[PDB]
Ligand binder design. Structure first.
Ligand SMILES: [C]OC1=[C][C]=C([C]([C]C2=C(Cl)[C]=N([O])[C]=C2Cl)OC(=O)C2=[C][C]=C([C][N][C](C(=O)O[C]3[C]N4[C][C][C]3[C][C]4)C3=[C][C]=[C][C]=[C]3)S2)[C]=C1O[C]
Ligand SMILES: [Mg+2]
Ligand SMILES: [Zn+2]
Length: 336
């Protein structure tokens, strides 16, 4: 019954429950969730989200099918990769869950859209090996061979997430109609493929056009009256969630920074041993963590969240303010 209540075994049910009081807040601490869930933050958080949104009831998903599926998905996240592990997946899922409740996006999305977006967040980095697409391509890896060099990892994450539905008692979409399943599959593919950084400038241009053309209901919510507008918001939302580390509390952000750099430097080490050129930010002998975080925010993270903020204005004002404070803290840490 730790299991019926939470995703998972804990023993530390009291502390776990306490952390999960922050389920609907940007300030939830996923590192604490992992510590109190026997390191199953992704199973735990997904279960809590799904109960909070009543999705198990709406889509006739038994608890046991859900947990079996989530534990399997979670087992396919590599625990020896410093950043792209199930902690990151749990964070993006939880962050997407919070974005979906933005007041300006109230009752805009259907249940199935909500299901697709959270599922997409959960699966979006599954079986990540801890190296970039470019590394896999340049080392002639099997994955790059499978996917003809194109969004290699993102294609793989989708394939794994969807293949795992076929394991015994894992079919969480068994009681959707055929058409819901087709629709959700289309949405999920769209969202996960959108997480490829090579598409970031396209997503952002489309987001800016949504801002420039936005329409507000009498009730004060955004009017999104076709599928194209809806999926475009959703894919930008999961992209935002994926790029949300610098907008959390500084104590959280710093831990995420430490892990992404540890992962980068390990790829740099493999590049160095093979005699390759070392990818940007991957050489531990020369990289500046601080310049790199401030560059990343200035060129990628702030323009995205600023545009997100303009779309739901003023509902992301506090996220934007925290990003800007964290950016200035890292800036002030640049030597000289
Ligand atoms: C926490 O933290 C973090 C977090 C997170 C992160 C992310 C993840 C991911 C991956 Cl991995 C992947 N995909 O697909 C997705 C995702 Cl989501 O990534 C990103 O996004 C990137 C990676 C890579 C790039 C591009 N390039 C860059 C550079 O290279 O850069 C240098 C130069 N210049 C000088 C120095 C440095 C800076 C500048 C850039 C460019 C331009 C600008 C900026 C950046 S993007 C990061 C981070 O950190 C960082
Ligand atoms: Mg990814
Ligand atoms: Zn990710």
């Amino acid at each position: 019954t730790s299991i019926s209540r939470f995703g998972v075994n804990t023993e530390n049910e009291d502390h776990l429950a306490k952390e999960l009081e922050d389920l609907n807040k940007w300030g939830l601490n996923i590192f604490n969730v992992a510590g109190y869930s026997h390191n199953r933050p992704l199973t735990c958080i997904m279960y809590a989200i799904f109960q909070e949104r009543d999705l198990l009831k709406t889509f006739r998903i038994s608890s046991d099918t859900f947990i079996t599926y989530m534990m399997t998905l979670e087992d396919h996240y590599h625990s020896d990769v410093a950043y792209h592990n199930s902690l990151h997946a749990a964070d993006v899922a939880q962050s997407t869950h919070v974005l979906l409740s933005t007041p300006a996006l109230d009752a805009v999305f259907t249940d199935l859209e909500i299901l697709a977006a959270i599922f997409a967040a959960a699966i979006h980095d599954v079986d990540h090996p801890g190296v970039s697409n470019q590394f896999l391509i340049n080392t002639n890896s099997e994955l790059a061979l499978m996917y003809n060099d194109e969004s290699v990892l993102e294609n793989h994450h989708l394939a794994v997430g969807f293949k795992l539905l076929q394991e015994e008692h894992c079919d969480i979409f068994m009681n959707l109609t055929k058409k819901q399943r087709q629709t959700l599959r289309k949405m999920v593919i769209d969202m996960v493929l959108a997480t490829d950084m090579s598409k970031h400038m396209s997503l952002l241009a489309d987001l800016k056009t949504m801002v420039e053309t936005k329409k507000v209901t009498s009730s004060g919510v955004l009017l999104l009256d076709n599928y194209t507008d809806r999926i475009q918001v959703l894919r930008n939302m999961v992209h935002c969630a994926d790029l949300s580390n610098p907008t959390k509390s500084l104590e959280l952000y710093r831990q995420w920074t430490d892990r992404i750099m540890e992962e980068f430097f390990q790829q740099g080490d493999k590049e160095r041993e093979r005699g390759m050129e070392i990818s940007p930010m991957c050489d531990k002998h020369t990289a500046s963590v601080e310049k790199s975080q401030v560059g990343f925010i200035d060129y990628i993270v702030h323009p995205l969240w600023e545009t997100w903020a303009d779309l739901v204005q003023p509902d992301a004002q506090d996220i934007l303010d925290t990003l800007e404070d964290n950016r200035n803290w890292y800036q002030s840490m640049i030597p000289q």
